[PDB]
């Protein structure tokens, strides 16, 4: 089952439910929709990337790649990550 997440700018981000639960505050908040009034697309897109990554590389005995964060979005993302608890 997937779920829809929505930016402040109204972009709609559809990710596997299992990946979204990576956030503690998207466990709570969970029709199968979530608005983030304070989180824009460029941030929320990146957050969904984090979900894909976390799930893929958690418990992986593979060597693991760095998660990239451009300086321009780093503050915004800290805030978002903080808010989502993930």
């Amino acid at each position: 089952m997937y779920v829809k997440l929505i930016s402040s700018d109204g972009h709609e981000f559809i990710v596997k439910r299992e990946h979204a639960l990576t956030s503690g505050t998207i466990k709570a908040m969970l029709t199968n929709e979530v608005n983030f009034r304070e989180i824009p697309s460029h941030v929320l897109s990146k957050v969904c990337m984090y979900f894909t990554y976390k799930v893929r590389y958690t418990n992986s005995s593979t060597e693991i790649p760095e998660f990239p964060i451009a300086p321009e979005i780093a503050l915004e993302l800290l805030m978002a990550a903080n808010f989502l608890d993930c």
Binding site: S7, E12, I14, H19, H42, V43, S45, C48, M49, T52
Partner: protein
């Protein structure tokens, strides 16, 4: 081996994975699983390049690298209503503000 993808239409973005040896028609069957539209109403694009239906994602140019979970490749999607396809349209994301001075 897995490739990680953002399937994008207008202001809509699907985060999903799939095999490199998986066909483009397979990808449409997933898209159907979500937007509920049938594959015959769906064109998919690498850039502006329309993707031949019976190619593998592999063949189209998506690979274990360049389509990574933390940097997933983009597949453009366009639908058909009443026998004409729309032009591939992907609304870009917001912009981050000017970098703080304290961060130079």
């Amino acid at each position: 081996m897995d490739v990680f993808l953002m399937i994008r239409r207008h202001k809509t973005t699907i985060f999903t994975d799939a095999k490199e040896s998986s066909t483009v028609f397979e990808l449409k069957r997933i898209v159907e699983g979500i937007l509920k539209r049938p594959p015959d109403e769906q064109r998919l694009y690498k850039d502006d390049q329309l993707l031949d239906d019976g190619k593998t994602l592999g063949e189209c140019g998506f690979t274990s690298q360049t389509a990574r979970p933390q940097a997933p490749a983009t597949v453009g999607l366009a639908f058909r209503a009443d026998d004409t396809f729309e032009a591939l349209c992907i609304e870009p994301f917001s912009s981050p503000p000017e970098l703080p001075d304290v961060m130079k």
